[PDB]
Amino acid sequence: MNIFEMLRIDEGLRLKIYKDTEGYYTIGIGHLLTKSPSLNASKSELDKAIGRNTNGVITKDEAEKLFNQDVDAAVRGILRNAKLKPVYDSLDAVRRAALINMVFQMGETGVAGFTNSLRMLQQKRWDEAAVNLAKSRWYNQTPNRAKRVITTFRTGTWDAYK
Ligand SMILES: [Cl-]
Ligand SMILES: [Cl-]
Numbered sequence: 001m002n003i004f005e006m007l008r009i010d011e012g013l014r015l016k017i018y019k020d021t022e023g024y025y026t027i028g029i030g031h032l033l034t035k036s037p038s039l040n041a042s043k044s045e046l047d048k049a050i051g052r053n054t055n056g057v058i059t060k061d062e063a064e065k066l067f068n069q070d071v072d073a074a075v076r077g078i079l080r081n082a083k084l085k086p087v088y089d090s091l092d093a094v095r096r097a098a099l100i101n102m103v104f105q106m107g108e109t110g111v112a113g114f115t116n117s118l119r120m121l122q123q124k125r126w127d128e129a130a131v132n133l134a135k136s137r138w139y140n141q142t143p144n145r146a147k148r149v150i151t152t153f154r155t156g157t158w159d160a161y162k
Pocket of ligand 2: 141142143144145146
């Protein structure tokens with residue numbers, strides 16, 4: 001198991017524009033297009049992201065290409081962020097993947113705000129961090145995915161994904 005496989009399970013794959021859990025226009029493997037309520041605006045963002053007149057449909061390779069860019073972006077975002085970098089650096093390989101998952105979902109800013117949880121993780125207080133992580137909108141809105149990520153941090157294994 002690795003970050004790509006992990007996120008592919010969490011986000012799924014859709015080749016046609018769809019609305020995510022929040023009602024936002026998305027495509028491929030969790031690639032957010034726009035938060036705007038306009039389908040056309042999303043089709044325009046899509047064409048701009050792909051480099052062609054897509055007409056709201058993309059191929060598998062194209063979806064995969066957006067995914068590679070998005071994962072790379074998340075990692076680089078973490079490394080550039082003063083609040084995240086130190087945590088990331090303190091973690092083992094598996095938990096690093098859990099941190100990347102959250103950033104991919106909520107954006108670096110979003111995650112940077114789980115101040116207390118971040119400190120617990122850095123301290124290696126696994127059980128406490130899992131408890132703190134659960135008291136959040138994130139957990140309440142996407143409980144199954146959140147549970148998978150939290151188990152990952154708590155155990156340091158890929159058990160929730162097997
Ligand atoms: Cl893009
Ligand atoms: Cl869920």
